[PDB]
Design a protein around this motif. Structure first.
Motif, mmCIF file in Angstrom:
data_model
loop_
_atom_site.group_PDB
_atom_site.id
_atom_site.type_symbol
_atom_site.label_atom_id
_atom_site.label_comp_id
_atom_site.label_asym_id
_atom_site.label_seq_id
_atom_site.Cartn_x
_atom_site.Cartn_y
_atom_site.Cartn_z
ATOM 1 N N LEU A 30 -2.432 12.980 0.696
ATOM 2 C CA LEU A 30 -3.062 12.862 1.999
ATOM 3 C C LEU A 30 -3.016 11.448 2.552
ATOM 4 N N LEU A 31 -2.200 10.572 1.971
ATOM 5 C CA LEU A 31 -2.025 9.227 2.497
ATOM 6 C C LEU A 31 -1.386 9.284 3.882
ATOM 7 N N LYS A 32 -1.270 8.123 4.517
ATOM 8 C CA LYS A 32 -0.717 8.077 5.863
ATOM 9 C C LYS A 32 0.766 8.420 5.833
ATOM 10 N N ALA B 193 -4.664 18.891 4.593
ATOM 11 C CA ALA B 193 -5.729 18.737 3.606
ATOM 12 C C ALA B 193 -5.995 20.043 2.864
ATOM 13 N N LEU C 138 -4.626 14.215 -4.794
ATOM 14 C CA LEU C 138 -5.114 14.508 -3.452
ATOM 15 C C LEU C 138 -5.175 13.248 -2.602
ATOM 16 N N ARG C 139 -5.527 12.113 -3.209
ATOM 17 C CA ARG C 139 -5.480 10.850 -2.485
ATOM 18 C C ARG C 139 -4.060 10.531 -2.036
ATOM 19 N N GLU D 176 0.837 -1.190 0.000
ATOM 20 C CA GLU D 176 0.000 0.000 0.000
ATOM 21 C C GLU D 176 0.874 1.243 0.000
ATOM 22 N N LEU D 177 0.519 2.212 -0.840
ATOM 23 C CA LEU D 177 1.264 3.459 -0.899
ATOM 24 C C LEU D 177 1.110 4.243 0.398
#
Lengths: 50, 293, 152
Positions: free
Chosen positions: C107-109, C78, C103-104, C21-22
């Motif tokens: 704003l990832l972890k 954000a 934007l996804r 996972e990115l």
């Protein structure tokens, strides 16, 4: 069609003309006995094709 | 939702940092009751979007829990974090995936929500979506890097949780993705073990159609047929025998799928397993998820 | 303001080995001196920051046509990401079809060295038109600073 308070899941319809070696009472008895068989009951519940 | 009263109170030094006994700020209350004008006014003037109490619930947690899309769509751009964990490690995407809030989840995912975020027991939103039988939610998560093979602390996969409850459409989505059909937990339970244990015959047929091991054994040597016989499911016993189950393989405890049927007195299971079994006090239980918010 | 000292953190968009996972993992940090994060998750010895010629050349190239959002009134990542992605579009730096994925990804972890042991590790990744991580195509170069400062 059923007077009992049991719900209907399966319908068996066997209609035809009078032919030799064809007794529709006996044909219905055979269909009902097959439906009452455990393996065929389970298989008809899990059937996705003929 | 008294916007003018909130504004007048805020002009006279009302503190938004004040929290109730439950741990709710005024932003929490607006997010609980869907007051989007009040939440807009609070966030405009010095409101922390990620304020939490002892339970760790943020305003995003209580907006998702009460299904307030407008509050969710307002909290996210201003700082409502999708990566905020509760006391049990639940994220706001955990709650949406359980409650089938697809549109909330799309907003949560768009702002960086992680579908593989884990609870304190290793439970991901995919685990909750699959357990609750939300096929559309599972497909959404699986398109956002959700791992369908990931197990919790006990090794249970989303296919294991589908087997416990018995949702065929979810297992169809998972199997098409590439999920291992014969995934094993810590004690060696496969999804066929769990589906046979819980009496979900439609998923037993589905798993057997997708090359599940009908004679798979756990670490204690229990077959999917010993679980069906132990729990009294006569039709799973029939369907497992017809798909290649062995009525003579024994477990490490020294029981055969029939001795177990005789031990708990299941006459119907004994009658069927008596025909196929030749002449010759431990109960096996699959692991479960006790997580709840 | 400032003029005394600052803390600079560098994070790289990578994928973990656990879930593929990115996510964002910090690669180095600066307090007047650079420390780099190792594969084991332990920071290396501080060192004076040496730069490569290509890095400075390409930094100048992207800075000459860069998008400077100065005195931006946002307090969360954000809002900062929303504002920058909108200006990228207003200036023909990213097409509007890329906004959702960017934007996804932005704003990832944002994970750190403490979470590196929980994940199976960090390997290089590339964002795809969807948002699925992808293994780089060009020959990946092992970090010089990791080799000469973190192998301890």
């Amino acid at each position: 069609a059923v007077e009992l308070p049991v719900p209907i899941r399966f319908l068996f319809v066997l209609l035809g003309p009078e032919a030799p070696h064809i007794d529709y009472t006996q044909l219905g008895r055979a269909a009902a006995t097959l439906m009452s068989e455990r393996v065929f009951r389970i298989d008809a519940y899990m059937a996705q094709s003929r | 939702g008294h916007v003018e009263t909130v504004l007048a109170l805020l002009e006279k030094e009302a503190s938004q940092a004040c929290m109730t006994k439950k741990g709710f700020t005024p932003l929490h209350v607006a997010a609980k009751y869907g007051k989007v004008r009040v939440a807009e006014l609070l966030l405009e003037r010095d409101a922390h979007p990620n304020a939490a109490g002892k339970n760790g619930l943020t305003p995003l947690h209580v907006a998702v829990h009460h299904n307030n899309l407008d509050i969710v769509k307002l909290l996210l751009p201003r700082g409502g974090s999708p990566h905020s964990p509760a006391w049990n490690g639940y994220t706001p995407l955990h709650i949406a995936a359980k409650q089938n809030q697809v549109e909330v989840a799309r907003s949560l995912l768009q702002y960086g929500g992680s579908a593989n975020a884990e609870s304190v027991q290793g439970v991901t939103p995919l685990h909750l979506a699959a357990q609750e039988g939300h096929a559309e939610m599972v497909a959404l998560l699986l398109s956002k890097q959700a791992n369908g093979n990931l197990g919790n602390k006990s090794g249970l996969t989303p296919l294991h949780l589908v087997a416990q409850e018995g949702h065929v459409p979810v297992a169809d989505v998972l199997i098409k993705h590439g999920v291992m059909v014969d995934a094993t937990t810590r004690m060696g339970y496969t999804p066929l073990h769990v589906a046979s244990h819980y009496g979900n015959i439609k998923l037993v047929k589905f798993l057997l159609q997708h090359q599940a091991d009908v004679n798979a054994k756990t670490k204690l040597g229990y077959s999917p047929l010993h679980q069906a016989a132990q729990q009294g499911h006569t039709d799973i016993v029939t369907l497992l025998l017809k798909n290649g189950a062995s009525p003579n393989e024994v477990s490490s405890d020294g029981t055969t799928p029939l001795a177990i049927a005789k031990r708990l007195g299941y006459i119907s299971v004994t009658d069927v397993l008596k025909v196929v079994t030749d002449e010759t006090h431990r109960m096996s239980f699959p692991e479960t998820v006790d997580e709840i918010l | 303001p400032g003029t005394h000292k600052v803390y600079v953190e560098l994070q790289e968009l990578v994928m973990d080995e656990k879930n593929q996972e990115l996510r964002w993992m910090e690669a180095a940090r600066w307090v007047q001196l650079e420390e780099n994060l190792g594969e084991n998750g332990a920071w290396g010895r501080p060192h004076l920051s040496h730069l490569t010629f290509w890095s400075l050349l390409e930094l100048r190239r992207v800075f000459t046509k860069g998008t400077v959002l100065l005195d931006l009134q946002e307090t969360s990542l954000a809002g900062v990401a929303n504002q920058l992605l909108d200006r990228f579009i207003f200036e023909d730096q990213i097409r509007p079809q890329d906004r959702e994925e960017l934007l996804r990804a932005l704003l990832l972890k944002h994970s750190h060295a403490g979470e590196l042991e929980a994940l199976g590790g960090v390997k290089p990744a590339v964002l795809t038109r969807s948002g699925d991580p992808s293994q780089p195509l060009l020959p990946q170069h092992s970090s010089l600073e990791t080799q000469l400062f973190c192998e301890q």
